[PDB]
Amino acid sequence: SDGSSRPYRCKIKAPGFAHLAGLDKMSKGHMLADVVAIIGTQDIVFGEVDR
Amino acid sequence: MFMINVLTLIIPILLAVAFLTLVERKVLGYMQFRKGPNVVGPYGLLQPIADAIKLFIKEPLRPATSSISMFILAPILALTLALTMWIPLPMPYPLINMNLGVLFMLAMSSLAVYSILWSGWASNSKYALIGALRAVAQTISYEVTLAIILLSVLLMNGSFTLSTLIITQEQVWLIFPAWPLAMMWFISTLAETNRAPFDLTEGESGFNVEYAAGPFALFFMAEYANIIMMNIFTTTLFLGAFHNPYMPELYTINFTIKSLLLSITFLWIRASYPRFRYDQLMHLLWKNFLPLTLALCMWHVSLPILLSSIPPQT
Amino acid sequence: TYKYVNLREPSMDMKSVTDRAAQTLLWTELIRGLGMTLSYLFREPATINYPFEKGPLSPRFRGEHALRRYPSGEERCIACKLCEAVCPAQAITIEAEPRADGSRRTTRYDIDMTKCIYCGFCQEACPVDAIVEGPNFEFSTETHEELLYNKEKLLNNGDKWEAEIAANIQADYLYR
Amino acid sequence: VKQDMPPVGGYGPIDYKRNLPRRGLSGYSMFAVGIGALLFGYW
Amino acid sequence: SRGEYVVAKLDDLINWARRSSLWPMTFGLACCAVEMMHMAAPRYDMDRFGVVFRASPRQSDVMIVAGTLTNKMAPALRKVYDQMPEPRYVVSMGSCANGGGYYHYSYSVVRGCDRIVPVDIYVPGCPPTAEALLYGILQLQKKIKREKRLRIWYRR
Amino acid sequence: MNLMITLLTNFTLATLLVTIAFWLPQLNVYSEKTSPDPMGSARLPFSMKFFLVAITFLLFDLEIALLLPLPWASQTTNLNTMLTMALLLIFLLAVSLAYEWTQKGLEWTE
Numbered sequence A: 001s002d003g004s005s006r007p008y009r010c011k012i013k014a015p016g017f018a019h020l021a022g023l024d025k026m027s028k029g030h031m032l033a034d035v036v037a038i039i040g041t042q043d044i045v046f047g048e049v050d051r
Numbered sequence B: 001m002f003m004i005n006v007l008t009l010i011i012p013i014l015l016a017v018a019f020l021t022l023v024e025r026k027v028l029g030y031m032q033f034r035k036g037p038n039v040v041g042p043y044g045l046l047q048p049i050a051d052a053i054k055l056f057i058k059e060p061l062r063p064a065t066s067s068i069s070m071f072i073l074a075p076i077l078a079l080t081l082a083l084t085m086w087i088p089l090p091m092p093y094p095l096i097n098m099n100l101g102v103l104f105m106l107a108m109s110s111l112a113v114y115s116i117l118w119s120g121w122a123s124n125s126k127y128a129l130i131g132a133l134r135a136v137a138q139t140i141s142y143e144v145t146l147a148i149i150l151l152s153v154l155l156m157n158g159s160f161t162l163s164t165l166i167i168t169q170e171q172v173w174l175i176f177p178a179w180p181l182a183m184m185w186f187i188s189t190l191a192e193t194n195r196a197p198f199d200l201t202e203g204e205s206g207f208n209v210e211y212a213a214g215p216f217a218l219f220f221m222a223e224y225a226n227i228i229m230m231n232i233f234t235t236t237l238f239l240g241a242f243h244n245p246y247m248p249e250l251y252t253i254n255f256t257i258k259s260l261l262l263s264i265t266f267l268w269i270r271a272s273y274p275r276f277r278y279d280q281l282m283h284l285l286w287k288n289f290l291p292l293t294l295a296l297c298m299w300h301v302s303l304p305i306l307l308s309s310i311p312p313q314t
Numbered sequence C: 001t002y003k004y005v006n007l008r009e010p011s012m013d014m015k016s017v018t019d020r021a022a023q024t025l026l027w028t029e030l031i032r033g034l035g036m037t038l039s040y041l042f043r044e045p046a047t048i049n050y051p052f053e054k055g056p057l058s059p060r061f062r063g064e065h066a067l068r069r070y071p072s073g074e075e076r077c078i079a080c081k082l083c084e085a086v087c088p089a090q091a092i093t094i095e096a097e098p099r100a101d102g103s104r105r106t107t108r109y110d111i112d113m114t115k116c117i118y119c120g121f122c123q124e125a126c127p128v129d130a131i132v133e134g135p136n137f138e139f140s141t142e143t144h145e146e147l148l149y150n151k152e153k154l155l156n157n158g159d160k161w162e163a164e165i166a167a168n169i170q171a172d173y174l175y176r
Numbered sequence D: 001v002k003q004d005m006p007p008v009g010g011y012g013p014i015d016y017k018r019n020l021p022r023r024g025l026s027g028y029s030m031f032a033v034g035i036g037a038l039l040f041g042y043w
Numbered sequence E: 001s002r003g004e005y006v007v008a009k010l011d012d013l014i015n016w017a018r019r020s021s022l023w024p025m026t027f028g029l030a031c032c033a034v035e036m037m038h039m040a041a042p043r044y045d046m047d048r049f050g051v052v053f054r055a056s057p058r059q060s061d062v063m064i065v066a067g068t069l070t071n072k073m074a075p076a077l078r079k080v081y082d083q084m085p086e087p088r089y090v091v092s093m094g095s096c097a098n099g100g101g102y103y104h105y106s107y108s109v110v111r112g113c114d115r116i117v118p119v120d121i122y123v124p125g126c127p128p129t130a131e132a133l134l135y136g137i138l139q140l141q142k143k144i145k146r147e148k149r150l151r152i153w154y155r156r
Numbered sequence F: 001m002n003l004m005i006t007l008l009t010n011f012t013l014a015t016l017l018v019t020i021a022f023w024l025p026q027l028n029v030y031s032e033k034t035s036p037d038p039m040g041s042a043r044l045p046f047s048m049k050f051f052l053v054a055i056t057f058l059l060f061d062l063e064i065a066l067l068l069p070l071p072w073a074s075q076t077t078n079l080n081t082m083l084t085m086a087l088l089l090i091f092l093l094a095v096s097l098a099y100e101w102t103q104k105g106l107e108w109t110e
């Protein structure tokens, strides 16, 4: 807050943003059909991931 | 008078697969707490007509066809192999009576993968080719286990003629002394038709992705014709009904009833299980189905000699 | 205050091992799933017959914007420009001038319905209850410019839906 | 005054624990039934 | 005459056939896609209208743009629309695909999906309710119902 | 000749269906699709397991054709020789399956 009635900076931290960051390590050694479940087990919603 | 019989065999096949689509739609709706199509007419009777006329006036997808002749030939071959294969079914008399009708159906079911191979070859995308190769490998392996199971079944019967199998199943059904073969045949009829929970033709890309909507509709009608064919084959060969030689329509009604409840069981099973993986069902046959099937074949080829129950050739 | 899910050690006796073998061979849990699907086949579906049946909604429902009137024929808005200042999407454009009798009234009240997010800040910031997020929701249009409302369309909406907006605000105003 | 309030006796108990029925026939008995069906069909 | 009456009958026949089996392509972008899935719930039940759920984009007849169409996604959406066979219809969910809505003045948001593809039915809301999209689909069916392809072909 | 009559009728009906699906919608004047897959530019990889399981299918189907004529053979006079031959052939199938199991055949495509 800068003192006025408007926010100076408002960062949104997404729980799914860091969860998708580990996806490269998540699917190491698994099959190509397992990424539809590895994406599934993390609650990944592309609204808060991309802001 | 023969061509009238051919027409009355081939037109109700198309009506039956259109109503397969309609009945499957409302059954999957009602299985999952929702409702099926009921707006177009009374209880959705006119929905398949709308489906057919919609799919017969749409634009194609316009693929970069490497081979135009192969692209034309694949759906013609698929519909031919689905439609001409219904002949030797004994309901209560076949249209054409062969001494080797089961071998006839087995051979054309084994060669039915040529449509999938040509569909993979007609599309220039390599991922479609990979999916086609995977589907072909699954189908040829599962045809191997079908061949062993059917070999056991007609060595129990003793004759390759399909009409004598009704006479064989007169006192008791074949499912009573061949129940483990029955369960393996039920998994094989669930699995050979590219169906869930082993449907890898939808999960991750189909084998006809670049094909037009007309050829896609032809492929779907062919697959559903194969579904009804092998459902009726299971009904006839594992659940043979009583057939009077003077009063045939009771047998026709009875095996129609068993075919309808077996198709309902198909729609039941397809709506209760999640999809497998490719290596999962490859492991299912190549390490779990094949040795048990071989042991069953050994037991059923050793049993009638030791039981003095070798069935007649004629 | 914490419970160990999936930390049940299976029994190693002959009874549980044989029962698990029977479950694996006879597909007993699959039979349970089949029975559950059969039981859920026979229930009455919850499908309401739209448009002959409508879903349950509340009097606080936020829908199509409308401009109300006093019970004397005069328009409620006084061109105070609170709704265009509070609008988070800036869909409201107001241009005003003192009219013939000297009353402070709007000359242009534009709501961009393609810009609006239906948040209801205008209906609560309005000190005279002029603009109301009305109850209408079946106003899908075939053309983009038909969703760009001027003052006349909003006033026609208010004259059309006042007979139910007045009842809704009468039933709701004690919560505000 | 008037506002949305729970009743003066409170609401009733609400179940929240896991509750699965658990049902079966024994494996030995099922295999005996399979053996009996096999021998009846063979006969 | 005979010809105008015959082509009128054939026109309404093919028009009923097209409007009774609208197979959609759902673009799962944002909030309005979740509202579409809740319109696919057993309560509202699109499937009784002849509208299947989650069809492939190579066989679909209509496309429902549900969500925000950013700059990074517009070529993909145009490619999908170009791949879908004729006749093709577009229904716009939400304020995002109508005119951008909340994000109309953002730097990386296309101000309306009309700038990329032709749009027939605009459904307003944020999100529009499930029955509102059902009414929009019925409005699209009525728009198809009054099409005059064969009459214009015979008159031309 | 009735069987070939049925085959010709069925093939011509399939030809009529594909002609309706291929040339009947050409009356419409919709558009021309210029149209300017995960496979970017790489060559198709030779996944050897698919070829291996295909030729394994071929060998198993060949000796299935060997195994076939038991229902006709069951009426023969020398039943002991038939029983020995059939049991030994199915044992050969089991032995080939065991070898294909052991030498890393059923791994990475189980």
Ligand code: SF4
Pocket (backbone or CB within 6 Å): C083, C086, C087, C088, C089, C090, C091, C092, C111, C115, C116, C117, C118, C119, C120, C121, C122, C123, C133
């Ligand atoms: S509901 Fe909210 S976004 Fe819509 S006009 Fe009113 S203040 Fe603006």
Ligand code: SF4
Pocket (backbone or CB within 6 Å): C076, C077, C078, C079, C080, C081, C082, C083, C084, C094, C125, C126, C127, C128, C129, C130, C131
């Ligand atoms: S807040 Fe109400 S009175 Fe003020 S300008 Fe808006 S509609 Fe008019």
Ligand code: SF4
Pocket (backbone or CB within 6 Å): E030, E031, E032, E033, E066, E067, E068, E093, E094, E095, E096, E097, E101, E102, E125, E126, E127, E128
């Ligand atoms: S219009 Fe509103 S509800 Fe729909 S996607 Fe945009 S922000 Fe979400």
